[PDB]
mmCIF file of C-alpha atoms and ligand atoms in Angstrom:
data_model
loop_
_atom_site.group_PDB
_atom_site.id
_atom_site.type_symbol
_atom_site.label_atom_id
_atom_site.label_comp_id
_atom_site.label_asym_id
_atom_site.label_seq_id
_atom_site.Cartn_x
_atom_site.Cartn_y
_atom_site.Cartn_z
ATOM 1 C CA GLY M 1 40.884 63.165 46.974
ATOM 2 C CA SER M 2 37.869 61.884 45.027
ATOM 3 C CA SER M 3 34.680 60.662 46.724
ATOM 4 C CA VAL M 4 33.367 61.063 50.284
ATOM 5 C CA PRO M 5 36.258 60.478 52.756
ATOM 6 C CA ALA M 6 36.025 57.781 55.462
ATOM 7 C CA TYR M 7 36.998 59.972 58.446
ATOM 8 C CA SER M 8 38.208 57.937 61.364
ATOM 9 C CA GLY M 9 36.916 59.044 64.770
ATOM 10 C CA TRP M 10 33.942 60.857 63.218
ATOM 11 C CA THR M 11 30.413 59.645 62.296
ATOM 12 C CA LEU M 12 28.983 60.439 58.889
ATOM 13 C CA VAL M 13 25.573 62.071 59.423
ATOM 14 C CA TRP M 14 24.600 62.684 55.778
ATOM 15 C CA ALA M 15 26.346 62.905 52.462
ATOM 16 C CA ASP M 16 25.649 63.055 48.715
ATOM 17 C CA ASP M 17 28.430 61.889 46.441
ATOM 18 C CA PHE M 18 26.378 62.695 43.297
ATOM 19 C CA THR M 19 26.699 59.263 41.702
ATOM 20 C CA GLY M 20 24.327 58.397 38.921
ATOM 21 C CA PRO M 21 23.830 58.739 35.151
ATOM 22 C CA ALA M 22 24.892 61.780 33.159
ATOM 23 C CA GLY M 23 22.078 64.244 32.685
ATOM 24 C CA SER M 24 19.941 63.019 35.595
ATOM 25 C CA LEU M 25 18.868 65.288 38.394
ATOM 26 C CA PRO M 26 20.308 64.964 41.915
ATOM 27 C CA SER M 27 18.041 63.148 44.350
ATOM 28 C CA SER M 28 14.781 64.828 45.212
ATOM 29 C CA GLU M 29 14.724 62.851 48.481
ATOM 30 C CA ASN M 30 17.873 64.729 49.473
ATOM 31 C CA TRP M 31 17.290 68.057 47.746
ATOM 32 C CA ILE M 32 14.714 70.758 47.116
ATOM 33 C CA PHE M 33 15.164 72.607 43.796
ATOM 34 C CA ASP M 34 14.430 76.267 44.325
ATOM 35 C CA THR M 35 12.895 78.023 41.289
ATOM 36 C CA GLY M 36 12.328 81.581 40.262
ATOM 37 C CA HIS M 37 13.549 84.862 41.728
ATOM 38 C CA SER M 38 12.632 84.452 45.411
ATOM 39 C CA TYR M 39 11.265 82.262 48.085
ATOM 40 C CA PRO M 40 7.476 82.538 48.145
ATOM 41 C CA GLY M 41 6.762 85.683 50.200
ATOM 42 C CA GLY M 42 10.503 86.241 50.570
ATOM 43 C CA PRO M 43 12.779 89.127 49.622
ATOM 44 C CA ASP M 44 12.963 90.051 45.911
ATOM 45 C CA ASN M 45 15.815 88.562 43.801
ATOM 46 C CA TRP M 46 16.924 86.178 46.561
ATOM 47 C CA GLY M 47 17.661 89.170 48.838
ATOM 48 C CA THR M 48 20.765 90.075 46.816
ATOM 49 C CA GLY M 49 19.653 91.695 43.508
ATOM 50 C CA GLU M 50 20.945 88.743 41.474
ATOM 51 C CA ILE M 51 19.180 88.489 38.141
ATOM 52 C CA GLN M 52 19.035 84.792 37.194
ATOM 53 C CA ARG M 53 15.942 82.650 37.262
ATOM 54 C CA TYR M 54 16.582 79.395 39.078
ATOM 55 C CA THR M 55 15.208 76.242 37.392
ATOM 56 C CA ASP M 56 14.934 72.483 37.670
ATOM 57 C CA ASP M 57 16.112 72.121 34.037
ATOM 58 C CA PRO M 58 18.841 69.411 33.563
ATOM 59 C CA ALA M 59 20.645 71.992 31.405
ATOM 60 C CA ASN M 60 21.165 74.062 34.583
ATOM 61 C CA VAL M 61 21.604 71.209 37.112
ATOM 62 C CA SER M 62 22.513 67.603 36.503
ATOM 63 C CA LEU M 63 24.932 64.796 37.367
ATOM 64 C CA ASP M 64 27.801 64.310 35.001
ATOM 65 C CA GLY M 65 27.896 60.489 35.225
ATOM 66 C CA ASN M 66 31.361 60.689 36.842
ATOM 67 C CA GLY M 67 30.279 61.316 40.411
ATOM 68 C CA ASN M 68 29.812 65.085 40.252
ATOM 69 C CA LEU M 69 26.974 67.531 40.199
ATOM 70 C CA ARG M 70 27.169 70.321 37.654
ATOM 71 C CA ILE M 71 25.333 73.639 38.175
ATOM 72 C CA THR M 72 25.548 75.755 34.974
ATOM 73 C CA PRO M 73 24.356 79.353 34.361
ATOM 74 C CA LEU M 74 22.985 79.786 30.852
ATOM 75 C CA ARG M 75 21.884 82.870 28.914
ATOM 76 C CA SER M 76 18.975 82.527 26.424
ATOM 77 C CA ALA M 77 18.614 84.285 23.076
ATOM 78 C CA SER M 78 16.086 86.564 24.849
ATOM 79 C CA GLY M 79 18.886 87.562 27.329
ATOM 80 C CA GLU M 80 17.571 85.757 30.378
ATOM 81 C CA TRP M 81 20.023 84.099 32.767
ATOM 82 C CA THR M 82 19.066 80.771 34.296
ATOM 83 C CA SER M 83 20.899 78.666 36.851
ATOM 84 C CA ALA M 84 20.113 76.341 39.758
ATOM 85 C CA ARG M 85 19.902 76.471 43.612
ATOM 86 C CA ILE M 86 19.368 73.323 45.583
ATOM 87 C CA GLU M 87 18.938 72.995 49.316
ATOM 88 C CA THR M 88 18.877 70.002 51.596
ATOM 89 C CA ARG M 89 15.542 68.639 52.900
ATOM 90 C CA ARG M 90 17.281 67.910 56.122
ATOM 91 C CA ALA M 91 17.541 71.006 58.286
ATOM 92 C CA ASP M 92 18.852 69.603 61.619
ATOM 93 C CA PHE M 93 22.591 69.793 61.109
ATOM 94 C CA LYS M 94 24.005 70.833 64.471
ATOM 95 C CA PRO M 95 26.849 69.602 66.713
ATOM 96 C CA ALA M 96 25.820 67.270 69.495
ATOM 97 C CA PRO M 97 26.369 68.888 72.917
ATOM 98 C CA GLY M 98 30.131 68.982 73.569
ATOM 99 C CA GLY M 99 30.966 67.796 70.057
ATOM 100 C CA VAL M 100 31.991 69.195 66.687
ATOM 101 C CA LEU M 101 30.036 69.364 63.476
ATOM 102 C CA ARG M 102 32.076 69.135 60.238
ATOM 103 C CA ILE M 103 30.447 70.301 56.995
ATOM 104 C CA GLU M 104 32.437 69.868 53.794
ATOM 105 C CA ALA M 105 32.173 69.934 50.008
ATOM 106 C CA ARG M 106 34.704 69.194 47.253
ATOM 107 C CA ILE M 107 34.142 71.714 44.448
ATOM 108 C CA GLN M 108 35.662 73.144 41.296
ATOM 109 C CA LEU M 109 34.487 76.647 40.647
ATOM 110 C CA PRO M 110 33.135 77.789 37.232
ATOM 111 C CA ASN M 111 36.273 77.766 35.099
ATOM 112 C CA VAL M 112 36.114 81.329 33.818
ATOM 113 C CA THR M 113 38.163 84.439 34.544
ATOM 114 C CA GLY M 114 38.450 88.141 33.692
ATOM 115 C CA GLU M 115 35.631 90.044 32.004
ATOM 116 C CA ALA M 116 34.068 86.750 30.886
ATOM 117 C CA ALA M 117 33.559 85.874 34.587
ATOM 118 C CA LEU M 118 31.812 89.078 35.755
ATOM 119 C CA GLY M 119 28.749 88.165 37.782
ATOM 120 C CA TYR M 120 29.454 84.496 38.404
ATOM 121 C CA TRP M 121 28.560 83.900 42.079
ATOM 122 C CA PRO M 122 29.045 80.242 43.169
ATOM 123 C CA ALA M 123 28.348 79.375 46.775
ATOM 124 C CA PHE M 124 28.129 76.504 49.265
ATOM 125 C CA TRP M 125 26.476 77.612 52.443
ATOM 126 C CA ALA M 126 24.215 76.886 55.355
ATOM 127 C CA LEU M 127 21.146 78.659 56.755
ATOM 128 C CA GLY M 128 19.490 78.387 60.092
ATOM 129 C CA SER M 129 16.420 76.160 59.953
ATOM 130 C CA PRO M 130 13.843 78.758 61.279
ATOM 131 C CA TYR M 131 14.341 80.727 58.061
ATOM 132 C CA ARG M 132 12.586 78.066 56.086
ATOM 133 C CA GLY M 133 8.944 79.081 55.581
ATOM 134 C CA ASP M 134 9.591 82.455 57.225
ATOM 135 C CA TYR M 135 12.163 84.271 55.074
ATOM 136 C CA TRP M 136 12.285 87.385 57.275
ATOM 137 C CA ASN M 137 14.294 86.269 60.332
ATOM 138 C CA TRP M 138 17.664 86.680 58.615
ATOM 139 C CA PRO M 139 20.355 87.267 59.835
ATOM 140 C CA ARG M 140 19.207 86.423 63.348
ATOM 141 C CA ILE M 141 19.001 82.676 62.664
ATOM 142 C CA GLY M 142 22.580 82.453 61.357
ATOM 143 C CA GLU M 143 24.265 81.812 58.047
ATOM 144 C CA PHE M 144 27.577 80.076 57.378
ATOM 145 C CA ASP M 145 29.121 80.803 53.970
ATOM 146 C CA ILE M 146 31.454 77.819 53.681
ATOM 147 C CA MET M 147 32.663 78.641 50.171
ATOM 148 C CA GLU M 148 31.720 81.894 48.471
ATOM 149 C CA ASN M 149 33.337 83.296 45.395
ATOM 150 C CA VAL M 150 32.712 85.934 42.713
ATOM 151 C CA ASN M 151 33.934 86.969 39.307
ATOM 152 C CA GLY M 152 36.230 83.982 38.586
ATOM 153 C CA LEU M 153 38.742 85.220 41.157
ATOM 154 C CA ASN M 154 41.265 82.813 42.639
ATOM 155 C CA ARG M 155 39.913 83.458 46.163
ATOM 156 C CA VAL M 156 37.472 81.827 48.560
ATOM 157 C CA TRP M 157 35.529 83.802 51.158
ATOM 158 C CA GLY M 158 34.287 82.204 54.371
ATOM 159 C CA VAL M 159 31.701 84.310 56.171
ATOM 160 C CA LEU M 160 29.378 84.357 59.175
ATOM 161 C CA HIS M 161 26.142 86.376 59.071
ATOM 162 C CA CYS M 162 24.264 86.961 62.354
ATOM 163 C CA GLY M 163 22.485 89.636 64.415
ATOM 164 C CA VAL M 164 20.443 92.217 62.545
ATOM 165 C CA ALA M 165 20.638 93.794 59.117
ATOM 166 C CA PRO M 166 21.798 96.274 58.075
ATOM 167 C CA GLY M 167 24.617 96.625 60.588
ATOM 168 C CA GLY M 168 24.534 94.925 63.973
ATOM 169 C CA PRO M 169 27.407 92.935 65.459
ATOM 170 C CA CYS M 170 28.075 91.005 62.252
ATOM 171 C CA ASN M 171 28.417 94.176 60.140
ATOM 172 C CA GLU M 172 25.682 93.234 57.659
ATOM 173 C CA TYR M 173 25.411 92.857 54.825
ATOM 174 C CA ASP M 174 29.183 92.183 54.723
ATOM 175 C CA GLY M 175 29.186 89.717 57.615
ATOM 176 C CA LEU M 176 32.253 88.615 59.513
ATOM 177 C CA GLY M 177 34.464 86.962 56.936
ATOM 178 C CA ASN M 178 37.953 86.322 55.678
ATOM 179 C CA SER M 179 39.397 84.957 52.473
ATOM 180 C CA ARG M 180 42.408 83.405 50.846
ATOM 181 C CA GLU M 181 43.679 82.152 47.547
ATOM 182 C CA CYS M 182 43.085 78.436 46.821
ATOM 183 C CA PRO M 183 46.199 76.409 47.661
ATOM 184 C CA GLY M 184 47.797 74.855 44.589
ATOM 185 C CA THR M 185 45.649 75.032 41.475
ATOM 186 C CA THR M 186 43.332 78.075 41.308
ATOM 187 C CA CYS M 187 39.813 77.687 42.633
ATOM 188 C CA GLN M 188 38.609 77.753 39.045
ATOM 189 C CA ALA M 189 41.003 75.201 37.548
ATOM 190 C CA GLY M 190 40.757 72.237 39.997
ATOM 191 C CA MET M 191 38.864 70.594 42.799
ATOM 192 C CA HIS M 192 39.396 71.908 46.332
ATOM 193 C CA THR M 193 37.847 70.827 49.649
ATOM 194 C CA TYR M 194 35.980 73.521 51.531
ATOM 195 C CA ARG M 195 35.421 72.681 55.190
ATOM 196 C CA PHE M 196 33.578 74.347 58.061
ATOM 197 C CA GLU M 197 33.626 73.203 61.693
ATOM 198 C CA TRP M 198 31.276 74.255 64.467
ATOM 199 C CA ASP M 199 33.122 73.243 67.640
ATOM 200 C CA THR M 200 31.420 72.984 71.000
ATOM 201 C CA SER M 201 34.116 70.745 72.488
ATOM 202 C CA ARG M 202 36.081 73.924 73.216
ATOM 203 C CA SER M 203 34.954 76.804 75.328
ATOM 204 C CA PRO M 204 34.584 79.427 73.943
ATOM 205 C CA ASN M 205 32.918 77.533 71.121
ATOM 206 C CA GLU M 206 34.450 78.163 67.699
ATOM 207 C CA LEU M 207 33.417 78.385 64.037
ATOM 208 C CA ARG M 208 36.364 77.576 61.673
ATOM 209 C CA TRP M 209 36.803 77.654 57.916
ATOM 210 C CA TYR M 210 39.334 75.736 55.829
ATOM 211 C CA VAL M 211 40.308 75.227 52.214
ATOM 212 C CA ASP M 212 42.354 72.072 51.506
ATOM 213 C CA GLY M 213 42.917 71.856 55.248
ATOM 214 C CA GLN M 214 44.313 75.376 55.491
ATOM 215 C CA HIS M 215 42.609 77.227 58.330
ATOM 216 C CA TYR M 216 41.871 80.810 57.327
ATOM 217 C CA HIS M 217 38.972 82.150 59.422
ATOM 218 C CA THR M 218 37.649 81.748 62.979
ATOM 219 C CA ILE M 219 34.760 83.258 64.910
ATOM 220 C CA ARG M 220 34.657 82.531 68.633
ATOM 221 C CA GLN M 221 31.741 82.580 71.075
ATOM 222 C CA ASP M 222 33.496 85.198 73.202
ATOM 223 C CA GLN M 223 33.512 87.609 70.266
ATOM 224 C CA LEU M 224 29.718 88.011 70.133
ATOM 225 C CA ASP M 225 27.169 88.691 72.794
ATOM 226 C CA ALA M 226 25.085 85.886 74.298
ATOM 227 C CA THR M 227 21.818 86.782 72.614
ATOM 228 C CA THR M 228 23.411 86.927 69.133
ATOM 229 C CA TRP M 229 25.122 83.592 69.683
ATOM 230 C CA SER M 230 21.971 81.908 71.078
ATOM 231 C CA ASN M 231 19.840 83.181 68.283
ATOM 232 C CA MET M 232 22.030 81.467 65.662
ATOM 233 C CA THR M 233 22.785 78.304 67.551
ATOM 234 C CA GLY M 234 19.870 77.491 69.885
ATOM 235 C CA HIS M 235 17.429 76.265 67.238
ATOM 236 C CA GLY M 236 17.291 72.830 65.615
ATOM 237 C CA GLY M 237 20.134 73.318 63.193
ATOM 238 C CA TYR M 238 21.021 74.273 59.659
ATOM 239 C CA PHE M 239 20.194 73.225 56.111
ATOM 240 C CA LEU M 240 22.756 73.387 53.263
ATOM 241 C CA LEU M 241 22.618 75.109 49.842
ATOM 242 C CA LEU M 242 24.521 74.908 46.596
ATOM 243 C CA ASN M 243 23.969 77.458 43.844
ATOM 244 C CA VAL M 244 25.465 79.677 41.175
ATOM 245 C CA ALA M 245 23.854 83.140 41.181
ATOM 246 C CA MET M 246 24.517 85.732 38.463
ATOM 247 C CA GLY M 247 24.975 89.306 39.442
ATOM 248 C CA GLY M 248 23.851 91.024 42.620
ATOM 249 C CA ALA M 249 25.436 92.433 45.734
ATOM 250 C CA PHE M 250 28.715 90.489 46.103
ATOM 251 C CA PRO M 251 29.897 90.324 42.420
ATOM 252 C CA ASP M 252 28.800 93.930 41.847
ATOM 253 C CA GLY M 253 30.659 95.092 44.929
ATOM 254 C CA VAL M 254 33.955 93.327 44.112
ATOM 255 C CA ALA M 255 33.792 94.415 40.419
ATOM 256 C CA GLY M 256 32.858 97.938 41.427
ATOM 257 C CA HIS M 257 30.032 98.023 38.872
ATOM 258 C CA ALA M 258 26.941 96.097 37.811
ATOM 259 C CA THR M 259 27.333 92.466 36.717
ATOM 260 C CA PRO M 260 26.892 90.421 34.603
ATOM 261 C CA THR M 261 27.695 92.401 31.458
ATOM 262 C CA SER M 262 27.376 91.593 27.760
ATOM 263 C CA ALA M 263 30.889 90.199 27.942
ATOM 264 C CA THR M 264 30.051 87.584 30.592
ATOM 265 C CA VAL M 265 30.349 84.144 28.995
ATOM 266 C CA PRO M 266 27.563 81.604 29.936
ATOM 267 C CA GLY M 267 27.863 77.891 30.333
ATOM 268 C CA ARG M 268 30.716 77.558 32.862
ATOM 269 C CA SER M 269 29.732 74.991 35.503
ATOM 270 C CA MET M 270 30.376 74.633 39.193
ATOM 271 C CA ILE M 271 31.345 71.023 39.649
ATOM 272 C CA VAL M 272 30.660 69.297 43.015
ATOM 273 C CA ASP M 273 32.106 65.878 43.818
ATOM 274 C CA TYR M 274 30.306 65.582 47.213
ATOM 275 C CA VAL M 275 28.735 67.307 50.169
ATOM 276 C CA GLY M 276 28.987 65.738 53.598
ATOM 277 C CA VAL M 277 28.189 66.303 57.243
ATOM 278 C CA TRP M 278 29.994 64.581 60.122
ATOM 279 C CA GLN M 279 29.730 64.580 63.878
ATOM 280 C CA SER M 280 32.819 64.068 66.018
ATOM 281 C CA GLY M 281 33.132 60.670 67.743
ATOM 282 C CA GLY M 282 33.215 57.343 65.922
HETATM 283 MG MG1 MG W 1 31.068 62.354 43.918
#
């Protein structure tokens, strides 16, 4: 399972296998490191209410020397949470006409459960390119949550956001999502492969989510109106994001109260073996 797979009949567009020395930062040619509490001129607290400050500190984001990236939330003596959020420089990931785009990452979630896990919000996701530099055309431009998880739970959510917010056809801010337990080892205790496919070889087109090859969510083109679909697909494509947020809308909603709490335990890393993007056709 380890390392970027050599998929037959597909063409690798872009990947990062996170190879390199322990403690070094992932490639700045590949990645932008987002810092602070918002995009510049964007919604406060990353649009979610999460409370961590994102950094470029190796303590929050670094390679492990074994081929993985680690993103680690930490809590200072002053009580401040820090973490990291990286996004791809490339923002043109999109299926070729009539083809399929496959986006995938192999990840172990922060290995923490129960009250110690309250607030942990790891995610691997994609945002429509027109958002970059604008920050106020969400959800119209589209968002694919390929792996989303909160609170150390043995469950992955896969979600589409689209339309307008609040409300609209994608029921924002919930989005159109589904979830399932990780197959085999819990999502926290081992590596799993989280895959998303955007399929234009079929009509209606389809968006599909998988964990370890188990298909658990679909959104089809015939389930949304034409303007909503065009708004999230007609532009130049998507960029990808990896982060671990602390607190905010999703972990608070699932816990039923504010997170993190004094009992949340810092220092539990999300571990990422690779991220990759493929187009169908060899
Ligand atoms: Mg790797």
